[PDB]
Amino acid sequence: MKVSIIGASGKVGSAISFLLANEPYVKELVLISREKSIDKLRGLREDIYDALAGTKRDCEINVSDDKTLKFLDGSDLVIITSGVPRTPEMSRLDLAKVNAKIIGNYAKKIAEICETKLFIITNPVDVMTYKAYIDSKFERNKVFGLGTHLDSLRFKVEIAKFFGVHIDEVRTRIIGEHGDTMVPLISSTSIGGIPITRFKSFKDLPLKDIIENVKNKGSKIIALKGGSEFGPAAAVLNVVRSIANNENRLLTLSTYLDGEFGFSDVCAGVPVKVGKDGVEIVTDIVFSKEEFEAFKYSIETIKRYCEEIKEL
Amino acid sequence: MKVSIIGASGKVGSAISFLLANEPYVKELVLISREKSIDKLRGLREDIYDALAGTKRDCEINVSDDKTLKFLDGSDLVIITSGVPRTPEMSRLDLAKVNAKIIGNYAKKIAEICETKLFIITNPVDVMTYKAYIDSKFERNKVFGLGTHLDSLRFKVEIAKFFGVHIDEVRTRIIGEHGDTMVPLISSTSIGGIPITRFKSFKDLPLKDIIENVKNKGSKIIALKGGSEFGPAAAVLNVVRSIANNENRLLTLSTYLDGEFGFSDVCAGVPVKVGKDGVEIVTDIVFSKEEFEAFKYSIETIKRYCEEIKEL
Amino acid sequence: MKVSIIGASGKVGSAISFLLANEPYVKELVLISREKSIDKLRGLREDIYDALAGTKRDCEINVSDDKTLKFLDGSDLVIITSGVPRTPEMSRLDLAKVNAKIIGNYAKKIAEICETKLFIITNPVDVMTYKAYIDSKFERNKVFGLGTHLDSLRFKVEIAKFFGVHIDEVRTRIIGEHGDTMVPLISSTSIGGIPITRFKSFKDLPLKDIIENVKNKGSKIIALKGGSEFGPAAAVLNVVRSIANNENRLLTLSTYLDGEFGFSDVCAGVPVKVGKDGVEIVTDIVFSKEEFEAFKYSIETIKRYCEEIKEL
Amino acid sequence: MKVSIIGASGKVGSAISFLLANEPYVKELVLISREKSIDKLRGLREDIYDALAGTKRDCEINVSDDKTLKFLDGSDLVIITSGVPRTPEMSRLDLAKVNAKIIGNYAKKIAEICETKLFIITNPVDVMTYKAYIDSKFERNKVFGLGTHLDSLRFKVEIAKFFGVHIDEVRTRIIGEHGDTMVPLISSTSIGGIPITRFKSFKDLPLKDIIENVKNKGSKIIALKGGSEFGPAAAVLNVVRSIANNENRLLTLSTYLDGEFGFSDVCAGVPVKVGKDGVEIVTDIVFSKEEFEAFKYSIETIKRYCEEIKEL
Ligand SMILES: NC(=O)C1=CN([C@@H]2O[C@H](COP(=O)(O)OP(=O)(O)OC[C@H]3O[C@@H](n4cnc5c(N)ncnc54)[C@H](OP(=O)(O)O)[C@@H]3O)[C@@H](O)[C@H]2O)C=CC1
Ligand SMILES: NC(=O)C1=CN([C@@H]2O[C@H](COP(=O)(O)OP(=O)(O)OC[C@H]3O[C@@H](n4cnc5c(N)ncnc54)[C@H](OP(=O)(O)O)[C@@H]3O)[C@@H](O)[C@H]2O)C=CC1
Ligand SMILES: NC(=O)C1=CN([C@@H]2O[C@H](COP(=O)(O)OP(=O)(O)OC[C@H]3O[C@@H](n4cnc5c(N)ncnc54)[C@H](OP(=O)(O)O)[C@@H]3O)[C@@H](O)[C@H]2O)C=CC1
Ligand SMILES: NC(=O)C1=CN([C@@H]2O[C@H](COP(=O)(O)OP(=O)(O)OC[C@H]3O[C@@H](n4cnc5c(N)ncnc54)[C@H](OP(=O)(O)O)[C@@H]3O)[C@@H](O)[C@H]2O)C=CC1
Ligand SMILES: [K+]
Ligand SMILES: [K+]
Ligand SMILES: [K+]
Ligand SMILES: [K+]
Structure with a gap:
């Protein structure tokens, strides 16, 4: 199985990266972040490798930016955790709008590259799943959120x-x-x-x-x-x-x-x-x-x- | 098995708490931190419980401060990750002195509570293992560090x-x-x-x-x-x-x-x-x-x- | 954990021996049979050891006859699969009687050696569990059958x-x-x-x-x-x-x-x-x-x- | 993964069928025997299903005779344990000749249906692997014995x-x-x-x-x-x-x-x-x-x- 994680630089994305890399069927993992966060991903990768040496598991991890989305092509699954921190001066609607822009951009680019399954974690998870569905133009069974x-x-x-x-x-x-x-x-x-x-x-x-x-x-x-x-x-x-x-x-x-x-x-x-x-x-x-x-x-x-x- | 983790409020201690709570034989876990960080532990516990619901595992988790060391009695193992962040101007010996005070205090208190095994992670790990050994007055086979x-x-x-x-x-x-x-x-x-x-x-x-x-x-x-x-x-x-x-x-x-x-x-x-x-x-x-x-x-x-x- | 298996020479007992020896917590397994079948158990032991080498597991396996019951003392659990084949001329009660003799003999001997849990597989399983309970004189929560x-x-x-x-x-x-x-x-x-x-x-x-x-x-x-x-x-x-x-x-x-x-x-x-x-x-x-x-x-x-x- | 087992009616093949059906990646298992032994395979299937219910695993098991080789097509792997028991009157060469006929026949029939990997257990295992390779005309990396x-x-x-x-x-x-x-x-x-x-x-x-x-x-x-x-x-x-x-x-x-x-x-x-x-x-x-x-x-x-x- 091949999984990409857009948002692996955050805490949720990093924990997901560690857990999934440890799964025996996950042979390739792709960590994707904004350019400025590439170094974070490079740290995460190394950390995870060390962890695998302790758990007796194995994985091959690649890193790319959120514009080229290199290595994303061919993924069985793309998990998206990217989302803005909701400041105290924001409503549910403000968060929805901003994260909708983010999720829609990523969904369009992914659909331009390949057909795959989208697993949405960004909140509001239902609304973001809806946005990903409409903007990816994927079949509805291929787009779902943790919900x-x-x-x-x-x-x-x-x-x-x-x-x-x-x-x-x-x-x-x-x-x-x-x-x-x-x-x-x-x-x-x-x-x-x-x-x-x-x-x-x-x-x-x-x-x-x-x-x-x-x-x-x-x-x-x-x-x-x-x-x-x-x-x-x-x-x-x-x-x-x-x-x-x-x-x-x-x-x-x-x-x-x-x-x-x-x-x-x-x-x-x-x-x-x-x-x-x-x-x-x-x-x-x-x-x-x-x-x-x-x-x-x-x-x-x-x-x-x-x-x-x-x-x- | 019962395990206490002094320093679970840190990133290493948090990850250790999550991984060990997931082990089927770890039935009791005690998270210990300084008083001001108790709330952090309270978050961690909840988070971990959630994770266990996803992994089909189970654990009972307790929280206490680093002065009372409540619930620590009876632990088969005590892992210590507590440590001061090493600033750029500190040498290894300065870090050793500060963290040696911390490790020795914890070792004395633990030895006053019960007999148990000490797993030292705090750096410099060899020197901190030494300090824990000499301050705890435990048998040497009971005191070890990751090294x-x-x-x-x-x-x-x-x-x-x-x-x-x-x-x-x-x-x-x-x-x-x-x-x-x-x-x-x-x-x-x-x-x-x-x-x-x-x-x-x-x-x-x-x-x-x-x-x-x-x-x-x-x-x-x-x-x-x-x-x-x-x-x-x-x-x-x-x-x-x-x-x-x-x-x-x-x-x-x-x-x-x-x-x-x-x-x-x-x-x-x-x-x-x-x-x-x-x-x-x-x-x-x-x-x-x-x-x-x-x-x-x-x-x-x-x-x-x-x-x-x-x-x- | 320590488990004895009386009847390991049969097919159910052999499969149980293999599965339990593979469990990480099962550190000692005692195989018990009638004297004439001891060689079978010996073979079984070797076989299981080879299997462990493949599964990356471990166990210590002892063998003993059903009269001395050597190595049974200290067992956390004793599983009994010993039973006679039901011939076409046997009524259900005939089977119950013949196997009640076996189960009651083993239960009395075990209770003479130590106190442990009894896991009865021999059919008719409910009736044989009853016999094991009355002949062992064990607390009722310590005697149970697959049922x-x-x-x-x-x-x-x-x-x-x-x-x-x-x-x-x-x-x-x-x-x-x-x-x-x-x-x-x-x-x-x-x-x-x-x-x-x-x-x-x-x-x-x-x-x-x-x-x-x-x-x-x-x-x-x-x-x-x-x-x-x-x-x-x-x-x-x-x-x-x-x-x-x-x-x-x-x-x-x-x-x-x-x-x-x-x-x-x-x-x-x-x-x-x-x-x-x-x-x-x-x-x-x-x-x-x-x-x-x-x-x-x-x-x-x-x-x-x-x-x-x-x-x- | 899809695995066929020719010889699953024997003891080694039955144990392999149990162990492989339990593996999460094995979604389909095909048990193959001579026509006369088909009922045995049916038994095995039911038994394994029951076992899966206890191990919380799952598998789709199909059964077929060793002439039509139904369900074999599409197998990632075919394991061959078919072999005659060495009677006290046979030398190693006699056994090799008989089992070589068996193995070569199976290898030709399999190659006639599809391309797959052949895992030879039948003894003399090296000689039978050689026979399977030459009679299947598969690439040599696809033919191997336990050895x-x-x-x-x-x-x-x-x-x-x-x-x-x-x-x-x-x-x-x-x-x-x-x-x-x-x-x-x-x-x-x-x-x-x-x-x-x-x-x-x-x-x-x-x-x-x-x-x-x-x-x-x-x-x-x-x-x-x-x-x-x-x-x-x-x-x-x-x-x-x-x-x-x-x-x-x-x-x-x-x-x-x-x-x-x-x-x-x-x-x-x-x-x-x-x-x-x-x-x-x-x-x-x-x-x-x-x-x-x-x-x-x-x-x-x-x-x-x-x-x-x-x-x-
Ligand atoms: N469905 C559920 O039950 C749950 C949902 N969530 C949601 O998941 C999301 C992530 O949470 P968490 O990991 O804790 O958050 P973090 O703040 O730790 O990480 C946020 C992630 O989003 C990225 N990001 C932030 N702003 C932007 C932007 N403008 N454009 C592109 N990427 C951006 C970050 O990249 P960078 O490093 O460059 O800042 C980072 O990868 C949140 O929206 C959160 O609400 C979280 C937990 C549970
Ligand atoms: N042996 C090895 O191979 C390794 C060693 N380590 C060592 O492990 C230790 C923990 O690292 P890490 O988790 O990343 O650090 P963090 O800064 O993330 O956490 C430090 C922990 O120590 C506590 N702490 C901080 N200051 C004090 C103090 N003065 N007295 C008592 N407790 C204190 C913190 O409590 P609070 O939240 O209240 O500040 C927290 O629990 C370090 O010494 C690190 O060098 C780490 C990795 C590998
Ligand atoms: N609870 C349930 O759902 C199930 C119950 N069972 C029951 O488990 C038992 C074992 O079944 P299975 O393994 O298939 O049977 P086997 O015939 O394969 O094995 C019988 C076992 O009992 C022993 N034994 C036979 N006769 C005697 C005797 N007179 N005195 C002492 N020991 C004796 C054998 O020893 P030896 O090698 O010396 O003959 C062997 O260990 C049966 O009672 C069976 O009905 C089985 C499956 C399911
Ligand atoms: N490489 C290694 O390390 C090992 C090798 N082996 C080899 O594995 C093989 C199987 O051993 P085991 O399972 O114990 O044997 P069993 O006697 O228990 O089973 C024999 C199997 O071979 C089949 N078979 C027998 N004769 C023929 C025939 N003439 N034509 C077709 N099928 C036939 C049987 O079918 P049916 O039920 O119809 O008779 C059955 O499936 C043997 O060759 C053995 O030497 C075994 C263990 C280890
Ligand atoms: K992996
Ligand atoms: K646990
Ligand atoms: K074991
Ligand atoms: K399976």
Whole structure:
């Protein structure tokens, strides 16, 4: 497998670079940054090589700038983490506009070079996935974002720590926006494979507070250590593992909707099977009326931003 | 296994925390920092939990300050990365004196709490291992530093990339000081288990350039990306994997010499077996005339610092 | 960890020996057989060692007869696969009686040597677990059998292959007897973490035929290949993995009931958490009315055999 | 990766099928046998599926007879373990003739269907590799046998157990015939990367006895348990892991010589790099006078048999 990472000079991109280089199937990794940051990438490469010597793994790493995009051609996957730091004097809309310009430029250049799969991490992840889709002119299954996957994993942590179980014993799914209008699917939450509603202690779960913790966790980590790096990198690792061996894992990822669930012209976190050819939306799942109404509200929340940045 | 990490607020300590929390046998992790950095640790913990949800692993993580050292009792291992940033005007001896005070204080406090193993990463690593040994009053096999292990892994990288082979195909051992007096053991360098001196292409290896590259790599990464992160953490992971399952791996780690090789009252990188009870020096290995001379010189170099910081 | 395997001369026992010797935490493995088969075990040991050389793993393997039980003392776990072939003229009760003698003899000898955990594979597995419990006099959480775990995994396979999903995507739980009275828990079946009943395609699943397949799979593999070996060995590996790192995985294993679900004096497959100290029955799960009724019937069926062998 | 196994109904082929199906990169496995043994393969398939459910792995397994060779087309690799048991009345030449007919027939049928790599396990492994190469008309880098690799691994075990070290700490290389004329490369024997001749304890190594044990291990395992299973399967696994991720591991495998080391028209165990495109002989290695004389003798020994079976 061949993976390029645009934004490897940041903390998230660097953690992703390290984790993916360590995967046995990742034979070639391409780190891409602005010209001024090339040296950072050169440091990262060396660091990662040292790390591989310790983990008994191997990889060949190339470095290029974000204009020529050399070595990008032929990539099975391009992960984009490039994004501006949102200053306190900015709105969600300001961040959306600026990062939309960045993501659209990169998507157009990538589409000019080759056909590949785009994995968007830049926030607002749903809106940036939408921008990447429209500007790349790729097939919609080839463009997806981390979206609510991270949220699901954080929710998992909460559940696992409240019930005092191994974190991997918990599975959960969150659909909709990677934001305050996210819709956790309690019906799709389980421990040891058993639905969480089948537990008598389920009544003791402070679900409302837990969901608020999930919605706030990104801001919390920003305030405490300056932002997440390992969490999102490992979520990306999980998705990439599904892609590399064509596992078709049922996850929640942001992708473009062309009629599914009665919605169109919007990117949102939905149930998807992730495999070598990208993302297939799973419509075979049945939602409760409450969950579907919250999902509708979330999609309509995303669409305002998408409309605002579509043609930038 | 229970591991405490004093200095997890730094980049090396953070990466070590992430990697070790991911190990299935590390069930308890204690992150320790100065009081003002507690919030950083609180971010790290959350981040790591998120990452574990992505890697299908699990851990219980606690946070404490570097004065109370709460939760440290019971640790099978204590890794110390705490250290002062070396300013441009500081010599190695100035750094040694400052960090020797820090390391000795931590060692005294830990020895007051319990008996455990100490894994010193703070530089100059040989001298800090010495200080930890003498201040802790622990058994010598219980006190060791990364030493020349990281140098050996970096040498592995250089060789593998020169000959174009998988990094894990190369094995090499470097003994002596983690510094300019390090002694590469070409007699114990191999590719595919084959001594490197049995390859006709060995004559083509620019050995002097490669060794200089290894000696200067820390500074190079400092200048390129701000300092090493993943390399050191993965080297620590390799050592800890040998410890957890009592593999008695033959590595080069810094530890106190009490007669081996005709030296005493010094810490230096030597071939050791790494197991659940610590490091055991391997004196059964035979060095070339030249390699033993170089190792003697390096030992003297290290002792000149150890004598200056012993009683601080 | 230290594991003894009584019955390693058979195919299931040999596969279990190979898989467990490869686990990094399994540092000592004791192979035990009747005297006449000691040579077989010797061969097995050599074979396994060669295999470890290929897998880059390690283990120390000892051999001993089933009378001295040398090297067994100190074992964290003892797995028993010794059993007689069921001939066409044998009733299920005839098999239970003949194998109860074997299991009870071994259990009494083991309890005379030391206290340990007993993992019973010999069929009829529920009845043999009961016999092991009464003859060892061990605490009930220390004695368990594979029970409906294998059936569970087989059910998983069926579902996955019908829906064309990765096998690890499916989770299911089967309780009751390891036999025709087993009770599949559709309320605890899921694909990608989503309850299977929330898929619109669930109506297409031929559940009755699949359950008959699971019930008959043992005999089918007997008729095709001469008996299962890899399936049960891997199921045992899954259980041991939960034990070794105290994961408390929620599985279905057979263990003695002392009041749970309104039953006592019987061993049956039930939800359990699997840890370093054995199995803890989980009563916090709520089955459907029909499922609990069928579970009651199955426990009665099992108890009828347990009463016949309690005094044998 | 797609792998076919001709001979999966035997014990070595069944163990290989289990191990390879468990590998994440092996998405499709084809089991091939004589028509009469097809049911056995069906059994094997079900068994392996059950095992995958326990290991959290996945695979698509197909079954076919050895005449139509259905599903074989498109295989990246075809492993041949088909061979008749050596009865006490047959000499090595008799066995070679019979198995040469089997191997040549299979090689021609495979080449008739598609181009692929052939991995020969059938004994005499060097002679059967020679026969497969000549009858398939494939490029020589695409045809290789396990050869002395297994021997090397067995030697590893011996060395490790003598020095009381973890098995993975030892590396060794044996070249020449998979038989009594094998040539151990003591220079290429190491512990922790340290050449074995640089240990003072090397004087105590009963080297000749260990070599005789290695030469006789196959017969010993046959006499004790009826033949090797897991050892050869794991050796195959190691090679296949090199192939699948193009690691180009430096191993000793049997392959056709066309001038390397001064020999031609023979298959023998030689140092090779094993990758996605097959084996590349490493002529860069230099042997001592004694090593080369032993290797030349072994080559002549093999050539006799090869000439006897070339036209069968
Ligand atoms: N989906 C999710 O759950 C998550 C989303 N994110 C998002 O990912 C992005 C990256 O986060 P993080 O790695 O922590 O951020 P950093 O600030 O550490 O890194 C930012 C990256 O973006 C690049 N960049 C910044 N401005 C520009 C620009 N104008 N043009 C091109 N490249 C630019 C930087 O390059 P340079 O070095 O030259 O400045 C660097 O590669 C953010 O938008 C963040 O919100 C992060 C975490 C989780
Ligand atoms: N042995 C080897 O091969 C290697 C050695 N190292 C050494 O590891 C150490 C850590 O490096 P790195 O993580 O990059 O450094 P960082 O600056 O990123 O982190 C330094 C750490 O030390 C703490 N610290 C700083 N000043 C003091 C002080 N006065 N008393 C106590 N603790 C203090 C910091 O706490 P706070 O956040 O509160 O400031 C933080 O936890 C250094 O000594 C470095 O040279 C690194 C790599 C390889
Ligand atoms: N729980 C489950 O889902 C499964 C249960 N099983 C059960 O596991 C057991 C082993 O199966 P399998 O490995 O295929 O059987 P094998 O016939 O291959 O091996 C039988 C084992 O039992 C020993 N044994 C046989 N007779 C006696 C006796 N009279 N006294 C003592 N030991 C004896 C054999 O020793 P020796 O070599 O000396 O004959 C050998 O170790 C059976 O009871 C089987 O039904 C198996 C698979 C699945
Ligand atoms: N290179 C090495 O280091 C090693 C080599 N080997 C070799 O591997 C081979 C297999 O050994 P093992 O698995 O233990 O043997 P088994 O007897 O267990 O299996 C034999 C296999 O060969 C098939 N077979 C036998 N006779 C014929 C025939 N006339 N035509 C076609 N297929 C036939 C069998 O098919 P069926 O079921 O229809 O009879 C079955 O698939 C042997 O040649 C053995 O010497 C083994 C171990 C190590
Ligand atoms: K890699
Ligand atoms: K852990
Ligand atoms: K082991
Ligand atoms: K597979």
